[PDB]
Amino acid sequence: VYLDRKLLTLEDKELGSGNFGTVKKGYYQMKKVVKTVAVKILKPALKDELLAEANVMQQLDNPYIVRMIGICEAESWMLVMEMAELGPLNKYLQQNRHVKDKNIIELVHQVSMGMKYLEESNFVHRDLAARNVLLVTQHYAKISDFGLSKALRADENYYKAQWPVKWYAPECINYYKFSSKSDVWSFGVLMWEAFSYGQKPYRGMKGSEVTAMLEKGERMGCPAGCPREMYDLMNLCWTYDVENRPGFAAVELRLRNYYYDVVNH
Ligand SMILES: COc1cc(F)c(-c2nc3c(NCC4CCNCC4)c(Cl)cnc3[nH]2)cc1OC
Numbered sequence: 001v002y003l004d005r006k007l008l009t010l011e012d013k014e015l016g017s018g019n020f021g022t023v024k025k026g027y028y029q030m031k032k033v034v035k036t037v038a039v040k041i042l043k044p045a046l047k048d049e050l051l052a053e054a055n056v057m058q059q060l061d062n063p064y065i066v067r068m069i070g071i072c073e074a075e076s077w078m079l080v081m082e083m084a085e086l087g088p089l090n091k092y093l094q095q096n097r098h099v100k101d102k103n104i105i106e107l108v109h110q111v112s113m114g115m116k117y118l119e120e121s122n123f124v125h126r127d128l129a130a131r132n133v134l135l136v137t138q139h140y141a142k143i144s145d146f147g148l149s150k151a152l153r154a155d156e157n158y159y160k161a162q163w164p165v166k167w168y169a170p171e172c173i174n175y176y177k178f179s180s181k182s183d184v185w186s187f188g189v190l191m192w193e194a195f196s197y198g199q200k201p202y203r204g205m206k207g208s209e210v211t212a213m214l215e216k217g218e219r220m221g222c223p224a225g226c227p228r229e230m231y232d233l234m235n236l237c238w239t240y241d242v243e244n245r246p247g248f249a250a251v252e253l254r255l256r257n258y259y260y261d262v263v264n265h
Pocket of ligand 1: 015016023038066081082083084085086087088091131132133134144145
């Protein structure tokens with residue numbers, strides 16, 4: 001897990017920031033080949049935050065989740081991850097307006113496969129948004145950004161916080177309780193983003209106005225040209241009651257079946 005700084009070259013290419021610090025493109029010399037990487041660079045609590053994120057990524061092994069190469073202790077603490085060259089899903093759809101519905105379905109279905117694995121592993125993501133979905137290719141999506149992620153206690157199906165509010169389920173906002181079903185709500189917001197060509201959800205609204213909207217039983221309207229089946233699935237992800245809301249196994253299956261209806265014209 002510990003990487004050699006002399007084997008890492010940081011490119012003059014920024015992929016993200018904050019916070020925290022910056023994300024830079026880089027190249028890491030492996031045992032024989034160089035690997036293209038994304039390097040999360042820290043610039044006291046922020047150190048433990050990065051190490052807990054590294055500890056979460058170390059435990060995960062699925063084709064639809066970004067792979068961590070390792071950690072690097074140098075000028076700054078660094079988290080070295082495999083590069084997804086096409087970048088975030090929202091930015092991609094904003095700039096590539098001719099992506100077919102079949103293709104958007106294929107991508108969000110891959111996200112649902114990665115989340116089904118996270119659900120089975122009893123980890124909660126807590127930052128599941130289109131900006132955190134990375135494209136390896138136009139037909140291959142991966143879940144990234146485990147900065148808010150938690151390993152659930154063995155005796156509880158939720159993490160209690162002691163925030164990307166527009167992606168959060170009511171139980172998160174009201175009770176600070178985060179479960180895999182809370183990630184399903186976020187997934188519904190992500191699907192809305194993907195079918196709105198990366199438009200931000202709840203445009204022009206304050207967090208408190210979003211809470212009020214949701215509590216009155218209101219939800220974002222159907223994106224122009226969105227398949228009805230996909231909008232219906234978003235509304236099922238947006239079930240107020242955690243108990244009636246589907247888990248990722250049920251979501252993955254519905255997306256998979258709908259994908260085959262679309263693939264076969
Ligand atoms: C065309 O514009 C982009 C192309 C890119 F390839 C990338 C990129 N960023 C990462 C990345 N980390 C940072 C992103 C985590 C999710 N939230 C967004 C920033 C990691 Cl871990 C692995 N591959 C990545 N590819 C970013 C881009 O625009 C921000």
